Design an enzyme around this catalytic site. Structure first.
Site, PDB file in Angstrom:
ATOM      1  N   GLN A  11       7.321  -0.128   6.171  1.00 14.21           N
ATOM      2  CA  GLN A  11       8.229   0.552   4.915  1.00 14.21           C
ATOM      3  C   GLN A  11       7.223   1.275   4.175  1.00 14.21           C
ATOM      4  O   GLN A  11       7.324   2.368   3.928  1.00 14.21           O
ATOM      5  CB  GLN A  11       8.629  -0.607   4.094  1.00 14.21           C
ATOM      6  N   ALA A  12       5.958   0.799   3.873  1.00 14.09           N
ATOM      7  CA  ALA A  12       5.175   1.492   3.173  1.00 14.09           C
ATOM      8  C   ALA A  12       4.578   2.850   3.713  1.00 14.09           C
ATOM      9  O   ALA A  12       4.485   3.898   2.875  1.00 14.09           O
ATOM     10  CB  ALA A  12       3.999   0.736   2.727  1.00 14.09           C
ATOM     11  N   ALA A  99      10.821  -7.678  11.691  1.00 16.15           N
ATOM     12  CA  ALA A  99       9.723  -8.795  12.026  1.00 16.15           C
ATOM     13  C   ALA A  99       9.683  -9.858  11.006  1.00 16.15           C
ATOM     14  O   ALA A  99       9.331 -10.960  11.417  1.00 16.15           O
ATOM     15  CB  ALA A  99       8.295  -7.957  11.867  1.00 16.15           C
ATOM     16  N   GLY A 146       4.165  -2.998  10.126  1.00 14.20           N
ATOM     17  CA  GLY A 146       3.294  -1.859   9.894  1.00 14.20           C
ATOM     18  C   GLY A 146       1.927  -2.215  10.661  1.00 14.20           C
ATOM     19  O   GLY A 146       1.132  -1.446  10.857  1.00 14.20           O
ATOM     20  N   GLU A 183       0.435 -12.921   4.539  1.00 11.56           N
ATOM     21  CA  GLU A 183      -0.349 -11.659   4.598  1.00 11.56           C
ATOM     22  C   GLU A 183      -1.745 -11.646   4.933  1.00 11.56           C
ATOM     23  O   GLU A 183      -2.069 -10.584   5.600  1.00 11.56           O
ATOM     24  CB  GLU A 183      -0.133 -11.043   2.692  1.00 11.56           C
ATOM     25  N   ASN A 206      -4.008  -2.397  -3.884  1.00 11.87           N
ATOM     26  CA  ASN A 206      -2.572  -2.295  -4.594  1.00 11.87           C
ATOM     27  C   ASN A 206      -2.979  -2.621  -6.243  1.00 11.87           C
ATOM     28  O   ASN A 206      -2.160  -2.319  -7.087  1.00 11.87           O
ATOM     29  CB  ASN A 206      -1.727  -3.389  -4.241  1.00 11.87           C
ATOM     30  N   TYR A 224       6.847   1.458  -6.762  1.00 15.03           N
ATOM     31  CA  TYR A 224       6.261   1.713  -5.497  1.00 15.03           C
ATOM     32  C   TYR A 224       6.274   3.331  -5.702  1.00 15.03           C
ATOM     33  O   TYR A 224       5.523   3.845  -5.183  1.00 15.03           O
ATOM     34  CB  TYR A 224       7.129   1.435  -4.368  1.00 15.03           C
ATOM     35  N   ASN A 228       3.145   5.655  -4.876  1.00 13.68           N
ATOM     36  CA  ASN A 228       3.333   6.523  -3.694  1.00 13.68           C
ATOM     37  C   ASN A 228       2.850   7.896  -4.347  1.00 13.68           C
ATOM     38  O   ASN A 228       2.195   8.637  -3.396  1.00 13.68           O
ATOM     39  CB  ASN A 228       4.535   6.367  -2.814  1.00 13.68           C
ATOM     40  N   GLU A 254     -15.548  15.441  12.481  1.00 12.97           N
ATOM     41  CA  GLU A 254     -16.716  15.389  11.811  1.00 12.97           C
ATOM     42  C   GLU A 254     -16.695  14.394  10.792  1.00 12.97           C
ATOM     43  O   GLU A 254     -17.742  14.182  10.118  1.00 12.97           O
ATOM     44  CB  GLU A 254     -16.432  17.006  11.005  1.00 12.97           C
TER      45      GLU A 254
HETATM   46  N1  LIG Z   1       1.482   1.220  -1.711  1.00 16.79           N
HETATM   47  C1  LIG Z   1       2.606   0.727  -1.028  1.00 16.79           C
HETATM   48  N2  LIG Z   1       2.504  -0.665  -0.599  1.00 16.79           N
HETATM   49  C2  LIG Z   1       3.878  -1.056  -0.287  1.00 16.79           C
HETATM   50  C3  LIG Z   1       4.970  -0.197  -0.140  1.00 16.79           C
HETATM   51  N3  LIG Z   1       5.865  -0.974   0.478  1.00 16.79           N
HETATM   52  C4  LIG Z   1       5.392  -1.991   0.922  1.00 16.79           C
HETATM   53  N4  LIG Z   1       3.972  -2.171   0.187  1.00 16.79           N
HETATM   54  C5  LIG Z   1       3.302  -3.266   0.599  1.00 16.79           C
HETATM   55  O1  LIG Z   1       3.163  -3.722   1.953  1.00 16.79           O
HETATM   56  C6  LIG Z   1       3.200  -5.073   2.304  1.00 16.79           C
HETATM   57  C7  LIG Z   1       4.649  -5.203   2.834  1.00 16.79           C
HETATM   58  O2  LIG Z   1       4.817  -4.099   3.900  1.00 16.79           O
HETATM   59  P1  LIG Z   1       6.029  -3.720   4.285  1.00 16.79           P
HETATM   60  O3  LIG Z   1       6.018  -2.258   4.676  1.00 16.79           O
HETATM   61  O4  LIG Z   1       7.081  -4.108   3.261  1.00 16.79           O
HETATM   62  O5  LIG Z   1       6.383  -4.264   5.763  1.00 16.79           O
HETATM   63  P2  LIG Z   1       6.767  -3.796   7.110  1.00 16.79           P
HETATM   64  O6  LIG Z   1       5.902  -3.108   7.745  1.00 16.79           O
HETATM   65  O7  LIG Z   1       8.267  -3.137   6.489  1.00 16.79           O
HETATM   66  O8  LIG Z   1       7.121  -5.032   7.966  1.00 16.79           O
HETATM   67  P3  LIG Z   1       8.038  -6.148   7.755  1.00 16.79           P
HETATM   68  O9  LIG Z   1       7.219  -7.360   7.638  1.00 16.79           O
HETATM   69  O10 LIG Z   1       8.940  -6.635   9.106  1.00 16.79           O
HETATM   70  O11 LIG Z   1       8.838  -6.143   6.514  1.00 16.79           O
HETATM   71  C8  LIG Z   1       3.229  -5.960   0.837  1.00 16.79           C
HETATM   72  O12 LIG Z   1       1.956  -5.978   0.252  1.00 16.79           O
HETATM   73  C9  LIG Z   1       3.823  -4.641  -0.049  1.00 16.79           C
HETATM   74  O13 LIG Z   1       3.595  -4.742  -1.397  1.00 16.79           O
HETATM   75  C10 LIG Z   1       5.030   0.998  -0.542  1.00 16.79           C
HETATM   76  O14 LIG Z   1       5.625   1.976  -0.321  1.00 16.79           O
HETATM   77  N5  LIG Z   1       3.616   1.503  -1.233  1.00 16.79           N
HETATM   78 MG   LIG Z   2      10.609  -3.788   6.153  1.00 18.66          MG
END
Ligand SMILES: Nc1nc2c(ncn2[C@@H]2O[C@H](COP(=O)(O)OP(=O)(O)OP(=O)(O)O)[C@@H](O)[C@H]2O)c(=O)[nH]1
Ligand SMILES: [Mg+2]
Ligand SMILES: Nc1nc2c(ncn2[C@@H]2O[C@H](COP(=O)(O)OP(=O)(O)OP(=O)(O)O)[C@@H](O)[C@H]2O)c(=O)[nH]1
Ligand SMILES: [Mg+2]
EC number: 3.6.5.-
Lengths: 438, 341, 191, 431
Positions: A11-12, A99, A146, A183, A206, A224, A228, A254
């Site tokens: 998602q991030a 996941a 991710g 986490e 964060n 968020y 971003n 490099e």
């Molecule tokens: N900087 C930032 N951190 C994010 C963002 N979205 C989620 N996070 C952080 O990333 C972690 C969660 O990752 P997600 O991207 O929600 O997880 P995912 O990759 O979608 O995978 P799942 O576990 O299946 O939900 C936590 O620490 C969140 O606070 C974003 O847009 N920006």
């Molecule tokens: Mg997700």
């Protein structure tokens, strides 16, 4: 010239790539539909923006990006966004099961029926590029998907695309903005599985970005979206070295020679200045010296650490906007007279400085103002090891009672992977201190 | 633009400096010039600047020795493509309306912070630029004695911070502007603002297109300002940080939800989008807070038994709206916590 | 729960046989006090022992020692309890201590007065829950044992312990505590 | 769109499932015909989680009812909502298991287990992405006790990547006088530990005592217990059928509430307590609900949540309460200095807030915690299982079908190990 492909994950990751592409389009002037009225060519080869974007016969600019997500909740909004005609439908890949904050899933359970298709889509973009430099991965250690899917793709590519660079832009999880209680496990697993699959990797605390948005930008509850937009500025300042016709870190290779002296150590700290809000646009005018000195402030750093209590191996400064070497000399002299920092005598790299004649840019009605100058400092110091120490505390405490461990072993994982991953973390922590021996 | 060191134990490797030096030498292609603390008193011989730098988009003449406004007007004439201008920190002496028009026909931005300019001189200086959008006037002690008539029409932004000489009487004069999308008033000493030209529920013609409004660092201690802000026809955004009400305390959050309840068209507060759930929670909290006061001043679920005094209507004009959105507070919702023995 | 319910019933069946014999009861009390002294400042055996003492006192096992003033056994027990309740922070350990202090008011003599003082120290604690529990235990003890307070002053103590919010600010609870102390003959504490 | 397959087996299981479906349909606004007639858009954003969108805008349930005896099948087919369940989702025989676990799991219930797999597989083929199966049965009997275990063991082999949740209903001597119940409960728990990720225990003695004292009912019948069971089921599955900030799926909830593999039995509850017929009498608040969710009287099991550690805590609020008002109340009860502070309401508790309230009530609350006190439910059956095992009473019936003392001793050892682990974890350092 050489092209590049950005592989976003999680998602991030997908939320950060959209903002980065929007900032790039606002800078280069690319319209939402993909039309550059300033470009005087139909195809790419002579311009400078062809490294990131791709030209066609119909004048359409298709960003070189491969967005891959498991939950369609975010991809559905990204498709129907303002730039629906910019990204190609084939580049956006969606799954059918999330996941649910799990690494053994994003890697073995949900990463097996999607990897066979991600490679076929990446090959379509790799065949079009005549000379690819590497890959720009964007994910986060917190998210299970991710992390797991990204590590699986990284090693899958290590076999095929072996003679290609590899970059990363992870997001270090924080206790406040925590989405999963597992986490610490996912992070320590993905850092050990891809400790050899990343030539260079960037970490974003964060907590640091939240404090910056709350103090500098003066925001009550930075969402968020705001976090971003702030990271997009640093991403653009970092990619300007390869996007424009500069002279410092123009190629991904490099980066491994001017910032990553040790192959194992690939976690250089990064800082960017200034951080002025939209209200106080024309309030104060900070010269190059002020923004260069502000880089040594823990509050302005992208990760919570203490570089003062640590040596320095590699340092790279990048100026953007109205900047003259005569003024940069003043800051260089102030860094030595006023401030003082040691260096590792066994390190080959040293200090490097570069300037680019490209002013910054901000989104209309955004949080940051259109400053006149910008500075980006990338320093590889052992102080960042502290950020890895606390991470090991939580993981160790949790694995002391082996809680939420059965959910991973019963999803295509072994009990020895955890011991291997923390044996690797211990070795990395020991090497971090051994490198900074007097 | 037309013109070794060691840190700790290593050298500084300045790379690409020759390219920047060669690019800056071309004075005929400088799209942005900045001369901060460069001692710029006069403009020099005319015609030279128009031929040496015929293409300039932004100039930063801040912190210079500019003594008269004619010296700046001379440079503004040769620069036909002058889009953004900034002449802050300059004790200029403006004429009595002698500045001719046509010198700034494409000026979209103009910063005049720390210049000692008065309201009588602002209108005379903004005479040759009807297409002026942004116009900053911070730290000037300007007194709004007059009002615009044939100038300051397309002023999309008007900053008047660091001026403790502004009140409602001075704001009413600059309230009939047609295109006024932003009006910053940070550190202005304001404390109250009303709209007697409109009643409860009805809108006011003053500040119609005022989208974003800033009122940070002020004596905002009454809910009478937030109650009066609802009369504004358009007001999608507002910032009220560092104030007697919205302090840095822990309970200050309780005030935030109140603001969202006093305005109906508040889609963002303090650079934070207000999602539907947040608005619903704020409205519920506002309806539950004054539940006892709504019944003390007359009120019942049946339309037959109903009689609200003018005080409750002027202090909580939006209570009747929520009464129909989420019904009226029942007798069981007015007992959230009481002592026991 | 079931284990405690069974152990208490099994222990009462044995105590019923050694309830009349003073030597057996004395030996049992001595062994219990020795075990208490051995495991002091220990959160593994102190809390269970304090909890079991509450039930032992509520069942009425040490009924022969109540016919004598200034009993060394009840004195050493109160001394050890004061040691174990010294700066007690956790509420789980404070509950057992309050229960023991309220189940020890049965022993007359200097153990009755001094023990009462402890209850006062618990009526103005740092948490309102502790004050409420202490007030409830004192009210229950006042109804259990009637020979502890005279009939002339029992009405006032009962009326003061009813219409009084023990979960309010200490500024108002201190007045009620002083009023109850002046009625129960307990000397006014000192900070 | 995550779908869930609901399965019902045994008389009690089917009676509970029918009531639960009727409750969640009346709460969603679905007439007994099949069409939709609610007055809220929130009752359709997640209806696909338990209803298939057939032709004509109709919502077909996903309840697969199985029963060897042709009794409850006909009753549910002609019920207030019998016309909703697909007609080929009913799988039954003629003679049941005769209160023998070795009949409804080996000789009889394994004769319709193949038709069950075909039905549950034909129902899941239409779903776009299955999340996890579900089962509602009673440990007492043979078709509820053996059939559920057989199906759980057969489905895990073909769908290992699916969550397995059940709603075991532990019997009690007060409700039933059958003597072959301890063995059926022990053998069911033996299989519900090694092939189950979550199990909601609903003891019958607790509901019996509640109806005897709380409701003050004369002769508590099966309907009074079924009503409470369906209410608790509807209150537990609130996040999986309505929107909200806490978007905890089934797998995420099981991972956050079940840190250990073997330990997974919860103590579900619900408040306020009501009965059939009238209901509107007194309107409760958030403080009163919070004070009552954590009372052992509002629990549906004979266990004291206070007496025992707290593995994981969770609560779901339903009504016009806001997550901000709830957080204020959940942050002052985990503090001693705070007034009206409770010692059994733990810290790091999960909390939810719903909009659509339940039926016949404006505000309610549901508790889904996991305390060590649940061990009492496993020991009560252990004693009754040993006294009857030493004399080898009613063991010939089991040895004749195919079972042997090996499975009995294995189940006994497993139960003993589980009780020992529970007792060991009950005494753990808080920090
Ligand atoms: N900087 C930032 N951190 C994010 C963002 N979205 C989620 N996070 C952080 O990333 C972690 C969660 O990752 P997600 O991207 O929600 O997880 P995912 O990759 O979608 O995978 P799942 O576990 O299946 O939900 C936590 O620490 C969140 O606070 C974003 O847009 N920006
Ligand atoms: Mg997700
Ligand atoms: N709460 C509740 N318990 C029930 C109900 N029906 C039966 N029981 C209990 O469950 C046990 C009997 O199991 P049943 O569900 O009737 O049996 P079955 O699963 O159909 O199995 P067979 O007897 O082999 O046909 C006894 O302990 C009953 O008290 C019911 O509707 N509600
Ligand atoms: Mg039956």
């Amino acid at each position: 010239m050489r092209e590049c492909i950005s592989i976003h994950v999680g998602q991030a990751g997908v939320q950060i790539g959209n903002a980065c592409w929007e900032l790039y389009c606002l800078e280069h002037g690319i319209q939402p539909d993909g039309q550059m009225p300033s470009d005087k060519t139909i195809g790419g080869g002579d311009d400078s923006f062809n490294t990131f974007f791709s030209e066609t016969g119909a004048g359409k600019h298709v960003p070189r990006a491969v967005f891959v997500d498991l939950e369609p909740t975010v991809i559905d909004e990204v498709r129907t966004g303002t730039y629906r005609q910019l990204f190609h439908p084939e580049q956006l890949i969606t799954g059918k099961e999330d996941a649910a904050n799990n690494y053994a899933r994003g890697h073995y359970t949900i990463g097996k029926e999607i990897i066979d298709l991600v490679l076929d889509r990446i090959r379509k973009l790799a065949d079009q590029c005549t000379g690819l430099q590497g890959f720009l991965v964007f994910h986060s250690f917190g998210g299970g998907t991710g992390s797991g899917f990204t590590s699986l793709l990284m090693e899958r590519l290590s076999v095929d695309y072996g003679k290609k660079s590899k970059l990363e832009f992870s997001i270090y999880p924080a206790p406040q903005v925590s989405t999963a209680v597992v986490e610490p496990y996912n992070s320590i697993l993905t850092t050990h599985t891809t400790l050899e699959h990343s030539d260079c990797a960037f970490m974003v605390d964060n907590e640091a970005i939240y404090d910056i948005c709350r103090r500098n930008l003066d925001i009550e509850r930075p969402t968020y979206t705001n976090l971003n937009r702030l990271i997009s500025q640093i991403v653009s300042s970092i990619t300007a070295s390869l996007r424009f016709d500069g002279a410092l870190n123009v190629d991904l290779t490099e980066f491994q020679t001017n910032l990553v002296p040790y192959p194992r150590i690939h976690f250089p700290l990064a800082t960017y200045a200034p951080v002025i809000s939209a209200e106080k646009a024309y309030h104060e005018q900070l010269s190059v010296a002020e923004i260069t000195n502000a880089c040594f402030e823990p509050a302005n750093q992208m990760v919570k650490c203490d570089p003062r209590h640590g040596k320095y191996m590699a340092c790279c400064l990048l100026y953007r906007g109205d900047v003259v070497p005569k003024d940069v000399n003043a800051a260089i002299a102030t860094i030595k007279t006023k401030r003082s920092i040691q260096f590792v005598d066994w390190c080959p790299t040293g200090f490097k400085v570069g300037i680019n004649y490209q002013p910054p840019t901000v989104v209309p009605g955004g949080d940051l103002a259109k400053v006149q100058r910008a500075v980006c400092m990338l320093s590889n110091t052992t102080a960042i090891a502290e950020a890895w120490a606390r991470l090991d505390h939580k993981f160790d405490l949790m694995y002391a009672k082996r809680a939420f461990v059965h959910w991973y072993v019963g999803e295509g994982m072994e009990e020895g992977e955890f011991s291997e991953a923390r044996e690797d973390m211990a070795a990395l922590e020991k090497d971090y201190e051994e490198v900074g021996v007097d | 633009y037309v013109l070794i060191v060691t840190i700790g134990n290593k050298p500084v490797e300045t790379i690409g400096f020759d390219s920047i030096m060669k690019q800056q030498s071309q004075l005929s292609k400088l799209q942005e010039v900045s001369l901060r603390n460069c001692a710029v008193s006069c403009a020099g011989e005319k015609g030279g600047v128009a031929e040496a730098c015929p293409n300039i988009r932004k100039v930063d003449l801040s912190k210079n020795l500019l003594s008269s406004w004619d010296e700046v007007i001379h440079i503004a004439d040769q620069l036909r493509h002058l889009e953004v201008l900034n002449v802050s920190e300059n004790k200029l002496k403006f004429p009595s309306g002698s500045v001719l028009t046509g010198t700034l026909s494409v000026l979209k931005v103009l910063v005049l912070n720390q210049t000692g300019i008065t309201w009588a001189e602002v209108l005379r200086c903004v005479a040759g630029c009807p297409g002026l959008e942004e116009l900053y006037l911070e730290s000037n002690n300007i007194f709004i004695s007059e009002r615009p008539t044939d100038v300051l029409q397309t002023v999309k932004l008007l900053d008047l911070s660091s001026n403790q000489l502004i009140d409602e009487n001075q704001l009413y004069l600059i309230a009939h502007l047609p295109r006024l999308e932003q009006l910053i008033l940070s550190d202005t000493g304001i404390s109250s603002l009303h709209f007697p030209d409109a009643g409860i529920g009805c809108k006011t013609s003053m500040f119609p297109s005022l989208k974003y409004l800033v009122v940070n660092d002020n004596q905002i201690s009454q809910w009478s300002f937030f109650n009066e802000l609802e009369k504004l026809p358009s007001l999608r955004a507002l910032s009220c940080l560092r104030n007697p009400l919205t302090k840095e305390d822990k309970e200050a959050e309780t005030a935030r939800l109140l603001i969202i309840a006093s305005i109906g068209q508040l889609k963002t507060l303090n650079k934070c989008e207000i999602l539907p759930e947040e608005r619903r929670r704020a409205e519920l909290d506002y309806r539950k807070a004054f539940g006892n006061e709504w019944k003390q001043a007359g009120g019942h679920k049946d339309p037959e038994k109903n009689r609200l005094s003018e005080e409750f209507l002027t202090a909580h004009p939006r209570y009747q709206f929520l009464c129909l959105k989420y019904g009226a507070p029942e007798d069981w919702e007015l007992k959230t916590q009481q002592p026991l023995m | 729960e079931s284990t405690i319910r069974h152990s208490t019933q099994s222990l009462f069946e044995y105590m019923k046989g050694i309830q009349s014999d003073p030597q057996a009861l004395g030996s049992f009390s001595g062994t219990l006090l020795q075990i208490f002294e051995d495991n002091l400042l220990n959160e593994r055996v102190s809390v269970p022992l304090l909890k079991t003492l509450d039930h032992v006192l509520t069942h009425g096992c040490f009924d022969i020692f109540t016919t004598e003033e200034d009993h060394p056994f009840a004195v050493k027990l109160l001394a050890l309890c004061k040691k174990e309740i010294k700066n007690s922070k956790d509420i789980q350990k404070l509950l057992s201590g309050i229960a023991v202090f309220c189940e020890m008011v049965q022993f007359p003599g200097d153990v009755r007065r001094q023990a009462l003082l402890q209850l006062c120290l618990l009526l103005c604690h740092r948490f309102p829950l502790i004050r409420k529990t202490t007030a409830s235990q004192v009210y229950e003890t006042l109804l259990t044992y009637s020979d502890v307070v005279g009939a002339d002053v029992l009405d006032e103590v009962v009326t003061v312990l009813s219409d009084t919010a023990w979960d309010a600010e200490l500024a108002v609870v201190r007045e009620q505590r002083n009023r109850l102390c002046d009625l129960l003959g307990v000397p006014r504490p000192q900070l | 769109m995550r779908e869930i397959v609901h399965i019902q087996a045994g008389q009690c299981g089917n009676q509970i499932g029918a009531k639960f479906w009727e409750v969640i349909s009346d709460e969603h606004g679905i007439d007994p015909t099949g069409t939709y007639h609610g007055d809220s858009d929130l009752q359709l954003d997640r209806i696909s989680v338990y209803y298939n969108e057939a032709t004509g805008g109709k919502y077909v349930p996903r309840a697969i009812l199985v029963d060897l005896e042709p009794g409850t099948m006909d009753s549910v087919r002609s019920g207030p909502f019998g016309q909703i369940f697909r007609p080929d989702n009913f799988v039954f025989g003629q003679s049941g298991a005769g209160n023998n676990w070795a009949k409804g799991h080996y000789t009889e219930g394994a004769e319709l287990v193949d038709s069950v797999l075909d039905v549950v597989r034909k129902e899941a083929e239409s779903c776009d992405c299955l999340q996890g199966f579900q089962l509602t049965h009673s440990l007492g009997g043979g078709t509820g006790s053996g059939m559920g275990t057989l199906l759980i063991s057969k489905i895990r082999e073909e769908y290992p990547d699916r969550i397995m949740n059940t709603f075991s209903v532990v019997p009690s001597p007060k409700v039933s006088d059958t003597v072959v119940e301890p063995y059926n409960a022990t053998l069911s728990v033996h299989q519900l530990v090694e092939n189950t990720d979550e199990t909601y225990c609903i003891d019958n003695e607790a509901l019996y005592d509640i109806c005897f004292r709380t409701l003050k009912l004369t002769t508590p019948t099966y309907g009074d217990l079924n009503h409470l069971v369906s209410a608790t089921m509807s209150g537990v599955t609130t996040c999986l059928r309505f929107p909200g900030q806490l978007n905890a799926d089934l797998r995420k909830l099981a991972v956050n509430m079940v840190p250990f593999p073997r330990l997974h039995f919860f103590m579900p509850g619900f408040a306020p307590l009501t009965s059939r017929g009238s209901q509107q009498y007194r309107a409760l608040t958030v403080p009163e609900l919070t004070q009552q969710v954590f009372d052992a009287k509002n629990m549906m099991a004979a266990c004291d949540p206070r007496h025992g550690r707290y593995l994981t805590v969770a609560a779901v609020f339903r009504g016009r309460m806001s997550m901000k008002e709830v957080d204020e109340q959940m942050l002052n009860v985990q503090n001693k200095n705070s007034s009206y502070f409770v010692e059994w309401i733990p810290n790091n508790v999960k909390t939810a807030v719903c909009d659509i309230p339940p039926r016949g009530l404006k505000m309610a609350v549901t508790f889904i915690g996991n305390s060590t006190a649940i061990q009492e439910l496993f020991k009560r059956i252990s004693e009754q299982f040993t006294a009857m095992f030493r004399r080898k009473a009613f063991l010939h019936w089991y040895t004749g079908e195919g079972m042997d003392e090996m499975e009995f001793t294995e189940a006994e050892s497993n139960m003993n190990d589980l009780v020992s682990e529970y007792q060991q974890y009950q005494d753990a350092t808080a920090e």
